[PDB]
Design a protein around this ligand. Structure first.
Ligand SMILES: *Cc1c(COP(=O)(O)O)cnc(C)c1O
Ligand SMILES: *Cc1c(COP(=O)(O)O)cnc(C)c1O
Ligand SMILES: *Cc1c(COP(=O)(O)O)cnc(C)c1O
Ligand SMILES: *Cc1c(COP(=O)(O)O)cnc(C)c1O
Ligand SMILES: [Cl-]
Ligand SMILES: [Cl-]
Ligand SMILES: [Cl-]
Ligand SMILES: [Cl-]
Lengths: 461, 462, 461, 464
């Protein structure tokens, strides 16, 4: 028996706000979830085409995963990373032996609790292995929020600072803010992508020049997102291979941050696998457990594992390897494999492409779309001017009025159809569902977006 | 039907080592746990007087906590922090209204997933609230391992660097290591009484004051402390904690009490700071927050700090922050703590442990000093002849040393013969803890095993 | 009587080496100088077409400057900046009223002892005035060697680190070597590509970087109008485009005129070729023509009015040194009265015509550009049409000088009694006094012709 | 014929202010100098017992130095460091072979143009030699104003920030302002009687804590400790044992010691260098000020034989345009030769002893003199309220310049002493920093001390 009015009162009074001022905040309670739906206390069913934060890959509240979690709870309990469990060892084995079994670069795994912790771990490993201080990142990359992970995050809207309520006058970034260099993203220098007289993209060419300017001996790693998640982009095809090749030639590591693109999200097990290359280190979260319980991970190459194995590593994280979280990881990955959700993701993405083609034929406010599996971006433009409504685009901050932001207006309208859809960036949709989402829910969501776009293209906002 | 030989094989092969080289590593599989016990696949029962990392406050595998997690799983699922749930709101209400209800400084709570995430959050909030860059920490403090939390960690043995196997030749800290000042710990400037100036002030505090004055108070956001150093294994002189509270107030600087370890009954109060009649501006939480049932951390901020943050849109997202199933575990953990009155149980067992340690010190000249409260104890170990620590670098040691040279390692190995896990992180100092509800029989059994280990240490046969 | 053999022994034994190891070092004593010549103890006259470090603008040992220094020494002595002198006030007046009299942005001057100190001062003022921490520099910029000036220096061959003797094995940068961002130099992205909103890709990306961090985080962009040590010339539109972009984003522009200032480029300052005005200028070299150590910063009226409202807690013992100020006064008065700016402009036109003839004759000249008495000549392999030294401006000094084209050219030209070459391996940096005679220009150019014949013969390989 | 009014107008309008707002600023012109005197345009003679910034060691406008500068100007001109000259090589030989000839440790010299550049150079060298990033400094150290030298300066009143005019309102430090650790001053940890606290083996607690600090970060992270043997701008003298205890601590930890001798060097303390009072030898010395007695801008670093041998094995990729400037080097040579031939080190030592006697007599007469100490021509005098025995300005060495000068005892003293045509005072609010030329006459010491006596009569009346 739940008093949801009291829940709302406690939520307003006792919880720190994010993205909303206390003044403007309206709690949105969710009582339960199932599949691709969120259920409100009043029983409203909301189709979630955010998939929360593109992180509930298996679907909400999967009975096999929950059954597995309950089973672990007959035995545990808690032990820290110094102790071995069946669940922890099995999860590592599934990742190296079963999912990555076709590639021979992967060596070992470290489990932590979050994607930010995974990136922190990867940054530490890369710097220790090379004995070099600098890490290269890209414009608009999001790699997490904790101190180290934030240093490689280049989105001024997502760096844990403060903005005003529909005002430009009360903004601040955190005082004090690094061993980090910002390179151009894949989406710079366009309008197609410019290459030199060698076919090398100008973003990569300049990335190479930056490393050489500092000296390769000063640079541990380039950390990337194969597709920018929060920053909401897709790369030209040759970018990922060219970065892999450039790093190899300069003797610098490449960390593929797969926290979002990992575990079937893009229609392969990992984002990088679309590109015929292999990373030195992968960071993991989100689909690692499909958010059933908090888990993150890093996978390091055999070379890197062999180096770390020769040393005593002075690093403790209390909940790293948590055996109940590991049981949840095991079950999540087993279901993913047995149901062949990767191939299902691939097929559903192809279906989504067709739906978006029709939406673009119909709606001139769709400037561009791209993606794969259950990860899509849709660039929104003024249908008249052919330019984005919000000039600062991906360099915006949240001090703007939401009623001026296209992705906000699309979200509010789509909501009238009982659909959750939109994006983090002001001019770009970021669309994701569970890997096992049904065609009918795809149709429902696309129809809702259709309805929102009519409204956007109508003015009246 | 679990093949534990194959589990050990996968564990060696596929998991990154910490503290042990692959060469020297032997997996120690634990098949299940209960109360104060770990159970091996063979069925051996191990009395855990580390309480893992002093973080299973309620006891292992509490039936009511586990039943509550099972219930949550009927409904969830996962929503991120933008969505409200009963479990998340209730957990915040329990902390603010029930546990801290008698104090009026607390305003609001932010939940995250780990103690390190909680410290990161507190550092961000302190700097934003004050609009100032610098944070003061102390020598030997441990506040976590992630970037920002690590900058305020002043233990060179726990900064996620590398050392060799029984060698000084393969030592490295992470390249690139800044907005932090290290002040003396409370355990500095002695006779063996703590030195004070002509007013009340401890020299550790007076110098901390001079340090902040040297940079300028307008540059300094906060002092972050542990009321009792956890990994660093110390206890303060009584006046330290009130004197730091008063100093920070006088300078217009915040105080963050990092209660990740000392929180939720560990010290025989709800919070460590509560022994000292003061209140902080911000508290960081983990460990006993959920008693390790599921991953959770949190920050509590004062009413003034909440009011300021409330006026702004805060551009911070953590995917698993507020995870509804973790919040369910937190609610159940806290309600069992309250209803069983585990805080009082911890206070009483602490008084009991004190008397057991007095008897052990009488028996053992290798016990130089011991101190603590509730289920958090330090025991400083000395060479019984020379009366000096065996390991000279003490709390400034690193793990390159041979464990056969380390008193707390020797003690741990020997105690293990009695089926008891007990020892410490520091080379010369035990860090002892159990569940808040640890029985007297288990205390006696742990203390007997320590007695036994100390005979061996003192025999010099090692 | 000077025992020059004893001087060499003392020089070997007691002075720290730079650029040469003790093992390879051979002292090069200079007994006196005059005009464009250096005179050895033996009486050999060497024509100096490096003009030392493009810093003896007025010419060596000007009789009027030396006579003015001698007069000042009848009165001083030394007073620090708190005390006023005629020489310090007059040097400030000459700069603001006389030299920059035709421009209305200049406000006040601060005198220091060197160009690095001038840059440190400008960085301090920029960050204080804007209350912002970040400063933007460019790839291959040189702005000095002291801590702050070094942070904006982006040449890995000039950051006060160490390299081996003809070896790659003993190289290090200073440990620790920071509120600075590196943008592309003007010589990136080529013939230069444009946004066709008109914007050079170098400027476009610089803009993006500032927007990505947030313009409210960025105090200034510091540039060289022509990269000195780094040895380049910009596309014509670059300097006006950077001025326009910084103004639009509310960011300061510091023109580092330590090298290009005081007639070097055939105008009083390099920026004056481009119809723009900076917010802050930094000065050294031609400020006194190296007669005595002096540097300076000039800040705009707005900046001066802000600084004037505060008590500035900055002391430099020798800043404003009355005798160095007497030297600056005499140096600037001679420059003005002899019309050396116009003379430099006319000699540069002459040099251009000499270089066109050498390029027509020497396929190892891939390219040249410059103005006044500041010229770059890019050298290439006449056969492949590409540079001999692949790392180019990202090299370090560990390589063998017998592999370096500008070292080859220098050794060869010395056989003609001419000092000429460059800091960069593939690029000449040529400078003489503003009053260098046509005869001496012909003599240097003839030595260069001779040197390129040798380079093109490939005998040194 | 100089128009001094026009000079003062150009000065007001076209020069950036330091320490004074434009609103409050009044130019103080000096037409010429001689010995220990500054001469105003009107012909007022001011006895300068600041010796500018304790940096005109030989005296103002020395005839032999000026003649040597004029001789150099018959030949030069300018050559950068890549070229050898007689003046540069001779200056290095004088330092290593003549001045420091009785010590075995010194190897080589690098000349630069300022003390801040010398400190920048020492920090670079210590970090390169050890291959470690951290340098340790102390509370209230002043090591210069440029980016690297500023990181090891721990006086918030001298870090090139901004404060308001007679207000706490409008203050700022430079945005963005680390591979530096701050250790306690030698002047920390005193008991009630003002005695320095030590452990039972006599080790000062300031040193004991410094060692703990280094051990906490790890000695393998720490390149160097940089010190001032006597804090200059920060205006202190150390407990006697501090300097040897730091030398011994650094040696035991494998860490370098940089003695920043920019102020204490070249006879200032009645020895060639401040460290020489203490029976120790540093790894690196930084020099400025008395190096040329400010005749022209010059700075230098001296490195040990072992550091020089390491540096000699590499190509060092570092250029400073004016480093080694031959005319500046000719001034250094003449400055050092005069110092040696006149035996100015001994003169300074004996004059310090005379000064001590005058200060003892002043302290009997004036209860506002809480303490004094020093040596040679470098003295501190701590000023207290004669009635409370407590400093007037509570923040003391951690003050900033936003304070009203009419509340600052060292400002009140300077203003009063000026009535007697003596310049005397200090940078810190409760502490005089007194210096004159090494060859200052007894009569001038008497004149300065009589002005101080006068000023303290006024301070002690409380009328201000
Ligand atoms: C969401 C995200 C992270 C951080 O994960 P958390 O679990 O939110 O801390 C890191 N990297 C990428 C690419 C992400 O999308
Ligand atoms: C263990 C600990 C932390 C870090 O918590 P984690 O959950 O391990 O990230 C922070 N502070 C203190 C005092 C701790 O004991
Ligand atoms: C030479 C130079 C400097 C530094 O001047 P120094 O007098 O060597 O300290 C600064 N900026 C530029 C552009 C330079 O060429
Ligand atoms: C004055 C001083 C400096 C800085 O020298 P400048 O010539 O002013 O740059 C450095 N160290 C000490 C001890 C000083 O007194
Ligand atoms: Cl990309
Ligand atoms: Cl403490
Ligand atoms: Cl350029
Ligand atoms: Cl001292």
């Amino acid at each position: 028996k739940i008093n949801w009015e009291q829940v709302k009162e406690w939520d307003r009074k006792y919880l720190m706000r994010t993205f909303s001022t206390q003044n403007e905040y309206q709690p949105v309670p969710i009582e339960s979830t199932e599949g691709d739906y969120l259920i409100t206390p009043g029983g409203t069913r909301l189709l979630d085409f955010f998939n929360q934060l593109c992180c509930v890959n298996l679907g909400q509240k999967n009975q096999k995963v929950n059954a597995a979690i309950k089973e672990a709870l007959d035995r545990y309990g808690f032990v820290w990373d110094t102790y071995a469990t069946d669940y922890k060892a099995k999860a590592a084995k599934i990742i190296i032996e079963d999912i990555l079994g076709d590639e021979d670069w992967p060596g070992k795994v470290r489990f932590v609790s979050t994607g930010s912790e995974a990136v922190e771990t990867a940054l530490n490993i890369a710097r220790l292995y090379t004995n070099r201080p600098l890490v290269v990142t890209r414009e608009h990359d999001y790699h997490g929020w904790t101190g180290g992970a934030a240093t490689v995050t280049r989105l001024r809207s997502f760096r844990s600072g403060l903005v005003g309520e529909n005002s430009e006058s009360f903004s601040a970034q955190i005082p004090g803010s690094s061993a980090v260099l910002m390179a151009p993203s894949s989406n710079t220098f366009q309008g197609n992508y410019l290459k030199d007289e060698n076919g090398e993209l100008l973003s990569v060419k300049y990335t190479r020049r930056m490393i050489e300017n500092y000296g390769p001996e000063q640079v541990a790693a380039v950390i990337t997102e194969v597709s920018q998640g929060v920053g909401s982009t897709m790369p030209p095809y040759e970018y990922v291979p060219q970065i892999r090749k450039m790093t190899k030639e300069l003797g610098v590591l490449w960390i593929s941050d797969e926290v979002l693109t990992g575990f079937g999200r893009t229609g392969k097990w990992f984002g990088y696998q679309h590109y015929g290359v292999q990373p030195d280190i992968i960071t993991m979260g989100k689909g690692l457990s499909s958010s059933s319980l908090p888990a993150g991970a890093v996978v390091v190459s055999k070379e890197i594992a062999a180096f770390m194995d020769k040393h005593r590593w002075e690093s403790v994280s209390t909940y790293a390897g948590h055996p109940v979280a590991m049981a949840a990881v095991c079950a999540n990955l087993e279901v993913m494999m047995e149901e062949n959700l990767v191939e299902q993701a691939k097929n559903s993405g192809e279906y989504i492409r067709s739906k978006l083609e029709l939406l673009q034929e119909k709606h001139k406010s769709i400037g561009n779309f791209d993606g794969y599996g259950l990860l899509w971006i849709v660039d929104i433009v003024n249908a008249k001017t052919k330019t984005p409504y919000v000039k600062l685009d991906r360099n915006f901050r949240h001090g703007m009025n939401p009623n001026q932001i296209p992705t906000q207006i699309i979200m509010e309208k789509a909501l009238e159809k009982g659909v959750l859809i939109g994006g983090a960036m002001p001019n770009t949709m970021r669309i994701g569902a569970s890997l096992n989402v049904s065609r009918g829910d795809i149709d429902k969501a696309m129809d809702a977006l259709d309805y929102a776009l009519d409204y956007l293209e109508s003015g009246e906002w």
